[PDB]
Amino acid sequence: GSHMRKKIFKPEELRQALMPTLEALYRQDPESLPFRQPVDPQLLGIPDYFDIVKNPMDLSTIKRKLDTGQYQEPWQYVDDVWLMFNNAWLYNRKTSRVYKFCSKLAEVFEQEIDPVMQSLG
């Protein structure tokens, strides 16, 4: 009965592994462009991207909460990152190139973060 206890590392360690994965998602150009900046349906003038997605999220959100240290567990990052891909597949569906761009990013995440969560999670 190997029962692991709440070990976790810290805001700095979580960054040491999560940031790198973030770079693996930002290294892409067309797939990580609108994902690094909010949409602001007001400036955009299109009330809809925020009405169907309770949490728009964006690469600038996780990276920011990480640069400061808002969460102490790694699950908060993997949960926020996937939450970002959730909105994409939740508002873009399969009828848009954004769902495609977000698709490769996700695959590149579960593949880049696999080693991290393996020793971090």
Ligand SMILES: CC(=O)n1c2c(c3ccccc31)CCCC2=O
């Ligand atoms: C740059 C910007 O904020 N916009 C974005 C979209 C827009 C659609 C119309 C206008 C602006 C838009 C589609 C979803 C991503 C996104 O990021």
